[PDB]
Amino acid sequence: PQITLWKRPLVTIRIGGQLKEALLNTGADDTVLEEMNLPGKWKPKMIGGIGGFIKVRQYDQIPIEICGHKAIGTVLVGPTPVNIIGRNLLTQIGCTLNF
Amino acid sequence: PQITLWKRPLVTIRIGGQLKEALLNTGADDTVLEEMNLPGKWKPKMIGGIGGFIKVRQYDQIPIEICGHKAIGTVLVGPTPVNIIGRNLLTQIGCTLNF
């Protein structure tokens, strides 16, 4: 689709069988979801944002469906304020910025 | 223009006639510039995201040019790690996400 930016660019995702709302975020390197359970092994990681650094769990090679498009890649889980789809998965679904 | 998302979407902006690099961030409501000593009246504000909040200075009706496209609006200044263009200005230059 074409998504304008008058409102936050929120979409529905499906992950581990569950539906959630996430923000399409060109300002994020990585995809970061609010605390949740995901299957499989994970590693501790840290990431930075506007306010400083937080600890997250890194899960590799996780399938996610984003606004109807399939992606499989790294998902971080931790105390983010909102679910964020970052560039690692935006590139998989063919997203660009246009003006 | 079309900006792909393989790399951080950094573009050149002009503020006060001077050039800076900034990140096009669909996950930011507002635009925040790295610390700079801008003239004019301002008001204190807190902005938040991953890692918590930071203190910034809010300036109003500041002209900016983003990749040659002119904009005017609210510009925040503080200890962000990178200059960030948010939706308040992305909408003015007709930016969309496309997939």
């Binding site: 923000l23 975020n25 300002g27 994020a28 390197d29 990585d30 970061v32 990681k45 840290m46 990431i47 930075g48 944002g49 506007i50 983010t80 304020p81 909102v82 964020i84 970052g86 | 990140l23 961030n25 996950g27 930011a28 409501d29 507002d30 925040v32 902005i47 938040g48 995201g49 991953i50 909040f53 962000t80 790690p81 990178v82 960030i84 948010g86």
Partner: peptide, 10 residues
């Protein structure tokens, strides 16, 4: 309310 979701690796 929180509104700037910049994020950088690690």
């Amino acid at each position: 309310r929180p509104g700037n979701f910049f994020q950088n690796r690690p």
